[PDB]
Amino acid sequence: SVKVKFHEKEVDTSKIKKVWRINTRLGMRVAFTYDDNGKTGRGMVPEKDAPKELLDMLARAEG
Amino acid sequence: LIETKVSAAKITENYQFDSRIRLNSIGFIPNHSKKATIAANCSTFYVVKEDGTIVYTGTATSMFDNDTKETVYIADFSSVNEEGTYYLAVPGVGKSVNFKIAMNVYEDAFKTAMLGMYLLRCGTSVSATYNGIHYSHGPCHTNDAYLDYINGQHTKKDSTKGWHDAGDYNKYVVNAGITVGSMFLAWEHFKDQLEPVALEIPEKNNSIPDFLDELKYEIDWILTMQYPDGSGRVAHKVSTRNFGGFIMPENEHDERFFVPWSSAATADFVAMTAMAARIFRPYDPQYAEKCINAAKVSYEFLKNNPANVFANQSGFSTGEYATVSDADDRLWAAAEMWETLGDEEYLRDFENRAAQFSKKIEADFDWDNVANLGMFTYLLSERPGKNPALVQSIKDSLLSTADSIVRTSQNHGYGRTLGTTYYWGCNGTVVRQTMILQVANKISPNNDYVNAALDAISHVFGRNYYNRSYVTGLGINPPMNPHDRRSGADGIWEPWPGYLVGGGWPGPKDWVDIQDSYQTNEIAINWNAALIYALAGFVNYNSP
Ligand SMILES: [Ca+2]
Ligand SMILES: [Ca+2]
Ligand SMILES: [Ca+2]
Ligand SMILES: [Zn+2]
Fold this sequence. Notes:
heterodimer, A: CATH 2.40.50.40, 5 strands, 17% helix, B: Immunoglobulin-like, 4-stranded antiparallel beta sheet, 11% strand
């Protein structure tokens, strides 16, 4: 598992719950929910910018 | 043998507003559906005139809202048709806000959504007084725009005018596409309703219908986006390099640039200018000729260059609006060229493309997926020559889709036409679904379609989990803190009026009315355009 940097916050992939792809007004993003001290947070990163580990989770979720 | 009615009864005035009673805070139309969602155990309810007189007694029915995972109680008071001001009184719970029943109930809201567009204008000072509050800014972005990224030369070519897109001030062709197409289809679909409408705009005394004046302000910008080389390629956007701060737009002095072309922007330009040509011709035929000649230049480019091309947005970090495919955009362009001009080549282009869509009509659509616009214009055209089997395939899908939206709204605890689907901008899509419903109603008149459109409208005006209007300046407890630069930067507590906020996601409770939330609480032309279409159908409308 690796750290996901997003706008600047850092989330370990081990904390991520759901991952999905969205074409937003800002560009293609990989969106996700994650565990934040027992609450659920939402984040997103540019697809071009996502680590291999997050992109693998997306591929699994999409398969 | 003998029947005499009991006297009308009046309410005791101890009823207090309760936030669990959720309904359309603007109101209702005679002869149409009228519902409230009561998120509390209850049975009896009364519809009460503002003076206390009870006009209707009903029983609320329990329903499971799978979206919020709660049992709610539905009060159906559709049979109340007398015009007036009322509230719902729910013994054991409280009362709703006051609402109106009127044939013209939505006209002020329509005018306010139109005001929002006026107030988004770029390149000019804007000024309006709204509920006694003066909103204004000086002339902005008057140096639009430079050609450095197009041809390497730091040459200015006029690219002023148009609308600021969102909470940022940049101007994006692809998002203009669905915005302008949806507003132009409001004009075509509801022309006799909208033609006489007077708006609070500077153009209120010229010879052009005011709805079209607003659109002309955008088309005037769109027309500037073709490449100066004469190729017909269309620049993707006019933008600063990065998103600026929360400043008034006349204080934004950073240079703005044309951004390299995309095939989708080029196709969207064709569709918008082809529509503009037929729509403006009765009022400004010189402008109409300009529009159609421009459309033709760009369509020739697209015919000779069939590939999907994404804009090269290197150097920019503002909105991308990088639609994944231009196939829908090109279908729409062909439809509009055909509708305006009639040539067999356009018809053949459209029909060949339309046949490749397995599902002809999609329930959930926005800037990225504009094929519905072409399907609508083709289906509704009075021109001869259409392939009968394609027409039938499109009709079947339109009606199947519309019937599904009715089923969604009927089985949702808050009448949400988009069901359990949430994403960035989804509030826009809720109301944009009214296009499918109204087009279905033209093809196969069905009250369920029109009532479902009113369920979409009701949803964004307070029949929702939050018990809030999603439109600045209107209805119950509207958004106060949109991600909107003018709102953030001016000296006024209330935000700029008339804007549909984007909506919460991924869930039904995820909307946050906080300025930092561009994800859930921004504004956008494509969202307003959807609201405008939705409300347009109920302007100068008589339901008898
Ligand atoms: Ca006018
Ligand atoms: Ca597209
Ligand atoms: Ca303010
Ligand atoms: Zn401006």
